[PDB]
Design a protein around this ligand. Structure first.
Ligand SMILES: [Zn+2]
Length: 22
């Protein structure tokens, strides 16, 4: 589990909930 509130690990710029996270 990751802190969706943190910039996606992919390194795109958007947070999980905004990127891969969702
Ligand atoms: Zn991503």
């Amino acid at each position: 589990k990751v802190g969706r509130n943190d910039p996606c690990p992919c390194g795109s710029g958007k947070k999980y909930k905004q990127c891969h996270g969702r």
